[PDB]
Amino acid sequence: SAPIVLDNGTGFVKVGYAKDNFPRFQFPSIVGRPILRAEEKTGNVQIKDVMVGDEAEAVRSLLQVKYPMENGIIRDFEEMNQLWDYTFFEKLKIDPRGRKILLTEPPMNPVANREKMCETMFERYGFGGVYVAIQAVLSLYAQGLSSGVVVDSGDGVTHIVPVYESVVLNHLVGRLDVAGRDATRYLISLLLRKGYAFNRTADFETVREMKEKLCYVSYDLELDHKLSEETTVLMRNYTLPDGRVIKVGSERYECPECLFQPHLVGSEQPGLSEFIFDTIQAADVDIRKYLYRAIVLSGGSSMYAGLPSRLEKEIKQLWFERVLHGDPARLPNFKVKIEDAPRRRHAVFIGGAVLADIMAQNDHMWVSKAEWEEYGVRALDKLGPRT
Amino acid sequence: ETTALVCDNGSGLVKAGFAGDDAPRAVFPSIVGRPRHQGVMVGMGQKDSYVGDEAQSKRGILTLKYPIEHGIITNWDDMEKIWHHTFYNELRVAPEEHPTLLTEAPLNPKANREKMTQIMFETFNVPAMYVAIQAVLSLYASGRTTGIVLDSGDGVTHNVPIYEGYALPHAIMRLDLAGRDLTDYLMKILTERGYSFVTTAEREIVRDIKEKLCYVALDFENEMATAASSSSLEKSYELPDGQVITIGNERFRCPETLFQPSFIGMESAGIHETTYNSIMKCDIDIRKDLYANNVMSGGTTMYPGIADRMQKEITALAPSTMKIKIIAPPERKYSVWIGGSILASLSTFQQMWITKQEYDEAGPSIVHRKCF
Amino acid sequence: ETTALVCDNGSGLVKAGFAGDDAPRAVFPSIVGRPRHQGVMVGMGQKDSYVGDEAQSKRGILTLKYPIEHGIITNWDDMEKIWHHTFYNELRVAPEEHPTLLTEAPLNPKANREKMTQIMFETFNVPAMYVAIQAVLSLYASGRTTGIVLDSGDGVTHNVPIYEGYALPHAIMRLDLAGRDLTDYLMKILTERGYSFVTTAEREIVRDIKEKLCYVALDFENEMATAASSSSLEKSYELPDGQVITIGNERFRCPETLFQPSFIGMESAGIHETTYNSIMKCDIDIRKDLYANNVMSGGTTMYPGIADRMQKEITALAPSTMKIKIIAPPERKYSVWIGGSILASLSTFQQMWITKQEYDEAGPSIVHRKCF
Ligand SMILES: Nc1ncnc2c1ncn2[C@@H]1O[C@H](COP(=O)(O)OP(=O)(O)OP(=O)(O)O)[C@@H](O)[C@H]1O
Numbered sequence A: 001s002a003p004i005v006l007d008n009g010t011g012f013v014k015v016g017y018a019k020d021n022f023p024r025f026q027f028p029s030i031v032g033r034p035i036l037r038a039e040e041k042t043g044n045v046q047i048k049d050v051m052v053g054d055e056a057e058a059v060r061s062l063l064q065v066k067y068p069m070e071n072g073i074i075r076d077f078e079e080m081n082q083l084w085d086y087t088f089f090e091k092l093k094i095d096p097r098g099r100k101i102l103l104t105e106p107p108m109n110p111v112a113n114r115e116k117m118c119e120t121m122f123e124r125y126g127f128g129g130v131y132v133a134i135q136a137v138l139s140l141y142a143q144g145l146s147s148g149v150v151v152d153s154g155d156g157v158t159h160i161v162p163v164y165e166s167v168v169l170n171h172l173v174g175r176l177d178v179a180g181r182d183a184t185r186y187l188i189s190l191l192l193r194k195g196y197a198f199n200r201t202a203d204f205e206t207v208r209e210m211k212e213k214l215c216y217v218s219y220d221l222e223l224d225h226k227l228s229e230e231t232t233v234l235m236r237n238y239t240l241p242d243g244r245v246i247k248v249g250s251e252r253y254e255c256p257e258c259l260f261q262p263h264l265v266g267s268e269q270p271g272l273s274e275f276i277f278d279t280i281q282a283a284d285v286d287i288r289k290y291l292y293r294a295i296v297l298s299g300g301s302s303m304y305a306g307l308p309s310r311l312e313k314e315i316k317q318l319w320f321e322r323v324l325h326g327d328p329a330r331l332p333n334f335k336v337k338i339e340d341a342p343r344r345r346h347a348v349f350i351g352g353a354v355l356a357d358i359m360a361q362n363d364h365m366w367v368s369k370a371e372w373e374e375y376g377v378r379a380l381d382k383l384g385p386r387t
Numbered sequence B, C: 001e002t003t004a005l006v007c008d009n010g011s012g013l014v015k016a017g018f019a020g021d022d023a024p025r026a027v028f029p030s031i032v033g034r035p036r037h038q039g040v041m042v043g044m045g046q047k048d049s050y051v052g053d054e055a056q057s058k059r060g061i062l063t064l065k066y067p068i069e070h071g072i073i074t075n076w077d078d079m080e081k082i083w084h085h086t087f088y089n090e091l092r093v094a095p096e097e098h099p100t101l102l103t104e105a106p107l108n109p110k111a112n113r114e115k116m117t118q119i120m121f122e123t124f125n126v127p128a129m130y131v132a133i134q135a136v137l138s139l140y141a142s143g144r145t146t147g148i149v150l151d152s153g154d155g156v157t158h159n160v161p162i163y164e165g166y167a168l169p170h171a172i173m174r175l176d177l178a179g180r181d182l183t184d185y186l187m188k189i190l191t192e193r194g195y196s197f198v199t200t201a202e203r204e205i206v207r208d209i210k211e212k213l214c215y216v217a218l219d220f221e222n223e224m225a226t227a228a229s230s231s232s233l234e235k236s237y238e239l240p241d242g243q244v245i246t247i248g249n250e251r252f253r254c255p256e257t258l259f260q261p262s263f264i265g266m267e268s269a270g271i272h273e274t275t276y277n278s279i280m281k282c283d284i285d286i287r288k289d290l291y292a293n294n295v296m297s298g299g300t301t302m303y304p305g306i307a308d309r310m311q312k313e314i315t316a317l318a319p320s321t322m323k324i325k326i327i328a329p330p331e332r333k334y335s336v337w338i339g340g341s342i343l344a345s346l347s348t349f350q351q352m353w354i355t356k357q358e359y360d361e362a363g364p365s366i367v368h369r370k371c372f
């Protein structure tokens, strides 16, 4: 009946229908092959040939996990085919031929990835409709706003896109190659500082949950260095699901610091706030307020504790240092407002669900199966002529 | 006739309204905007084009264009678009029930007359219309039967000496220098301060800079020499984006282009040499009153202190044996509209309109036969 | 006087060498590299900042950033460091003896020129110096005196028409599209093939790729249609790593921005239309001659096949009765330097230097009363 919407994110998969509010099902984009190591390997129920999704992440102890998507693109495609099969056949267990699907994709992906993903979706499933939309416009839809710049930070890659009054500035879209996965890798290294080693595959998800529960974004660097240098209050105790406890100190505020200082992970690209400032400044002089006045955080990786406050303070400070050249006279004449909606993690899904019935009931807006087969790959231009 | 409409299709601004009134309900820059960014977002009905105050408000994304340049028209499609805007949006009156008054500068090519009159005929089917020169209304607004005028606008500046109901056609000349060229030179001189303005949207803010932070000096060499201690003349302008502008000698350099056109590669007589030549080419018996019956009109003459400089300069060129005066009404900008309304308010002007019955057999060429 | 020095501080590269010669003594990128690793290697004297060819050699670890932005210097400290490096490494002559010569973009914010001459007189003690626009040097390079110079480099591009004797300042057009923007757009479109370049050293690698494997299409839609069968437009490159890069229509898509600025979202007219407008602004007495001579100069204009498309499109815009030729010197990269050397070699130029003796009592503003 209602069109289906799919958000195949790098670290998670969300799926649902139109008019929905919260994602119907969310599960990591993982594929589990069976493996036997030096564990106890209790035979809970059974181990099948290929286990993916919630069952995979639950039985992860006895299986190795491979991530089909890296850096926002699909590395190995057979595993990702298994992922769509799982999602369509048991997560929703409804697999008609001819339904309408609205896909998602970060802005500056290779053409081949999107083209062959659409080809797979057509041929292997036979769906009668398709549409691929940027996550940024969906994030904009989530709050119903029309003008403003929205930043999306996920597991794979963080991107920002400025939109002013229902016009997407395709020549100023952002792409910062630092995301939650890089933060997790830096967390693993920072734990290797002390002596703890996480070289298994389930340990990756373990430390991901650790960073989920404990790590936080600093608001004042020198204050937190003083706190971690003189006081032991920052120490937290975390017990692994295996049952072992470790000590975490400065790692809590040093893990997500790589987002703001990418040189920690060996990235030449500027930090989050600096990149946002450059993107806003490169725009025309007329829309600069509405770019500053409405900055919307989105994505799972933006859920860091104390991130909106640090972002607002840092953007104001950087404006003061870069424009006013140290003059504090005109500082109180600046209006910046970072949006921090509670569901900025599923803003992409919410925007996709809204767009599902925004443009429904008229198939002449997107691509059909016949049009695809008789205009080849080049038929995939009705969606958008983005750069 | 119920009501009479008068409209002066000026190069930058368009003024329209019912005759016999004082406040124009239809004033807005002659701007046609089109979305430059091809990529658009589905929904909310992205309009194909924008015109008027709406276009000015959304100047950030569009690429605004001026249908009129130097007075000649190049964008007749935009002409019908803006005329439709004027007739329907902000007047709410059906065009086919009221007469219209049209204006333009002298020495306009005849084909312009033909096309404007012909589109007035078919595209709108208005009852009747008349077209004349802007300077005629400029003088008629003041209620003066004789005196030279200087109609400086956004794209046209022309001098029209006027006798008792007539004029000396050998004595009218029109100068292309106007607000557009002033804006261009202002950009070319503000590139000094590091400020850059290339996009049309930035042209629209350069125009505001000129409107609000410009004045005319009285003795350019002396004041430029004393500007070496640039402390009492520099001002501050707040750009829309949020920074500040420290305007300097360019706040008075750009309007000086009118007096000396040699700074824009225009080897032409100055704004006072043109007046001197025009009056000297007039009759000897009217040199006396033409020396002291000059008026200011249009939006270009809003410069503070330009009247005193113009008066003293034309006095310097003129013989000192007799007195010189200047007339600068505080409504120079709407003088043309007021004159048009007054002329259409004439008790006996209803028979000088041109209804359908003439064009039903005559054709567009008869406008030069009677209308002027 | 022993000799003379010419240093064209371009946005990307610096061509410094003695006058009276056709081969530059030293040409190298204008990059100041500072390492981003606190893990100092104790010993073997590695210095805090790297400039010149050493920056290119060690770009694997430094953070390369140009000290010129669109022809405007913004990091005067690294500017003076570069000048120090030049004078006492690649020239090995103290500036106290040999006078220098500099080049400046037209319509440049003159605070740049003032600070330039001030800092040179302060920290270099040059006996004398001069500043000239690259356009006049480009015109002098071919030995003629007519034509309009299309000088496009790393920061900005500009056109300055000129007849025998005197130039036409009101017709000078300048656009910021240049080699840096071309490299940026090439990097932006390379990610559509899966190849990602983010670091500054990667920017240099992409710039080398653009040097080696780029050309301008004769007809854009025709070549795009030809791109249906990936036969001839497809080439390969060898990365310094050892990788292999496959390049397609991006070979000719990125130089197209010179003619379609909307590709990178810059509202403007392509350089061909800019040249056409600039020549049209000239009077009828001068364009009949300026059409024939079109001087092409700069690093960007070295593209293979750009001259043919330039010629065909300029004749497309111009009336069909015109004969237009494009000048394509095989030494266009150093054309500005050769023009400067020729200008300095003339014995009729020693009179209008800028000596310290006149500078002391006139201050830094003398650069405006002397040069132009
Ligand atoms: N409260 C939190 N604190 C820290 N990190 C969080 C929090 N919530 C979510 N995250 C991070 O967000 C990530 C999930 O992001 P999500 O899967 O929605 O992005 P994505 O859709 O994969 O991005 P893309 O569309 O670019 O692939 C997780 O890897 C997790 O580390």
Ligand SMILES: Nc1ncnc2c1ncn2[C@@H]1O[C@H](COP(=O)(O)OP(=O)(O)O)[C@@H](O)[C@H]1O
Residues within 6 Å of the ligand: B009, B010, B011, B012, B013, B014, B152, B153, B154, B155, B156, B178, B179, B180, B210, B211, B212, B298, B299, B300, B301, B302, B303, B333
């Ligand atoms: N307050 C002001 N101060 C200075 N100049 C002004 C002011 N208002 C308008 N102008 C100038 O007047 C011009 C508008 O002229 P306009 O009345 O539109 O002539 P026309 O009606 O013939 O097109 C603008 O270019 C602007 O530069």
Ligand SMILES: Nc1ncnc2c1ncn2[C@@H]1O[C@H](COP(=O)(O)OP(=O)(O)O)[C@@H](O)[C@H]1O
Residues within 6 Å of the ligand: C008, C009, C010, C011, C012, C013, C014, C152, C153, C154, C155, C156, C179, C180, C183, C207, C210, C211, C212, C214, C298, C299, C300, C302, C303, C333
């Ligand atoms: N052979 C070439 N083909 C195409 N582009 C080139 C070539 N050589 C140099 N360039 C471009 O020209 C630029 C250098 O221009 P340059 O002459 O240094 O201008 P400027 O002196 O104003 O910096 C470089 O950024 C490069 O991208």
Ligand SMILES: [Mg+2]
Residues within 6 Å of the ligand: A009, A135, A154, A299, A348
């Ligand atoms: Mg996402």
Ligand SMILES: [Mg+2]
Residues within 6 Å of the ligand: B008, B010, B134, B151, B153, B298, B336
């Ligand atoms: Mg007028």
Ligand SMILES: [Mg+2]
Residues within 6 Å of the ligand: C008, C009, C010, C011, C103, C134, C153, C336
């Ligand atoms: Mg140069």
